[PDB]
Design a protein around this ligand. Structure first.
Ligand code: OGA
Ligand code: MG
Ligand code: NI
Ligand code: ZN
Length: 331
């Protein structure tokens, strides 16, 4: 078995290997990359996502989210308070203000220490989940707005044509902005490209050990657990590496820098934080290997998780027994 310790693998494809996305994902899996739940892909030196980032300041962040924490430094939840709209240029200035800017630090490990020590005492503002793309239309390789759609994959694998679309999302981050422990909708893959700015630190649990994280989360968030049998679908809970280590949960960590891709694999729980002002683009995707994970994915039916239009068909076709209850949670 390849990669039996479930380490995060880093790939350096040549420009020739960068042509065929599906083929390269299957290659990475042949080497065991999925066992970690997360992989890094450094694009060939010849590649670029677009020519410059000089003209992005007029993009609108219609609903910036202030991420307010509750709990203790290593075990907390966050809720998202909606703020007034602002442009990317306005948000970048905000991120660089004395109130929100990255503190002085020695290296990524020092910054990671400071994040876990101090996150809960501040409420950073995240421009998340903005439909759109920063890939130039002329970028032909690994252009996250030109991937094969998950609806087309389900149709190719299973023969059923379904409604729905699959488009990317932009994320504008600042110091301490935080993504809570989660897997993707329907335990899909994700791919994330850091277009510009400061790094993003990731934590990930191997898919084979995901249920260990879930059991710890039920212990640590006992009211939330009683409220919903899949409360990590709410995307609000954080657990630090120190707490994970104290409770014997297998995980790994890695820092993504600008110009790098990350791939999350089906049922790979992940969480993380931004080091300073940045912009990322991400989208879900599927492969044939995903279908079995889609069929087994947990679902929130309590009403909290509320997701896209396109997840309807996935539930309806892959999980017909669950469909009725899940749809009630959507409506
Ligand atoms: O970058 C972020 O805030 C969150 N991204 C992801 O969870 C992802 O790409 O799957
Ligand atoms: Mg602009
Ligand atoms: Ni994710
Ligand atoms: Zn729920």
């Amino acid at each position: 078995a390849q990669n039996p310790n479930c380490n995060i693998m880093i790939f350096h494809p040549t420009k020739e290997e960068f042509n065929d996305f599906d083929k390269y994902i299957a290659y990475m899996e042949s080497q065991g990359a999925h066992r970690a739940g997360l992989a890094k892909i450094i694009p060939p030196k010849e590649w670029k996502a677009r020519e410059t980032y000089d003209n992005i300041s007029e993009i609108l962040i219609a609903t910036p989210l202030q991420q307010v924490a509750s709990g203790r430094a290593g075990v907390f939840t966050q809720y998202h308070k909606k703020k007034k709209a602002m442009t990317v240029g306005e948000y970048r200035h905000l991120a660089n203000s004395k109130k929100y800017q990255t503190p002085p630090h020695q290296n990524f490990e020092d910054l990671e220490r400071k994040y876990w020590k101090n996150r809960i005492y501040n409420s950073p503002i995240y421009g998340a989940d903005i439909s759109g793309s920063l890939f130039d239309e002329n970028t032909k390789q690994w252009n996250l707005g030109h991937l094969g759609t998950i609806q087309d994959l389900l149709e190719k694998e299973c023969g059923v044509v379904i409604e729905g679309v699959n488009t990317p999302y932009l994320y504008f981050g600042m110091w301490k902005t935080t993504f809570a422990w989660h897997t993707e909708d329907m335990d899909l893959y994700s791919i994330n490209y850091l277009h510009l700015g400061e790094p993003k630190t990731w934590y990930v649990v191997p898919p084979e050990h995901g249920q260990r994280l879930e059991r710890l989360a039920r212990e640590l968030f006992p009211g939330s657990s009683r409220g919903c049998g899949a409360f990590l679908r709410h995307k609000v809970a954080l657990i630090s590496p120190t707490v994970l280590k104290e409770n014997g949960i297998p995980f790994n960590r890695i820092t993504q820098e600008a110009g790098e891709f990350m791939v999350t694999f089906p049922y790979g729980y992940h969480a993380g934080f931004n080091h300073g002002f940045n912009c990322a683009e991400a989208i879900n995707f599927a492969t044939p290997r995903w279908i079995d994970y889609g069929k087994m994915a947990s679902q929130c039916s309590c009403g909290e998780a509320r997701v896209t239009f396109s997840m309807d068909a996935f539930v309806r076709i892959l999980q017909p027994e669950r469909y009725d209850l899940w749809k009630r949670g959507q409506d």
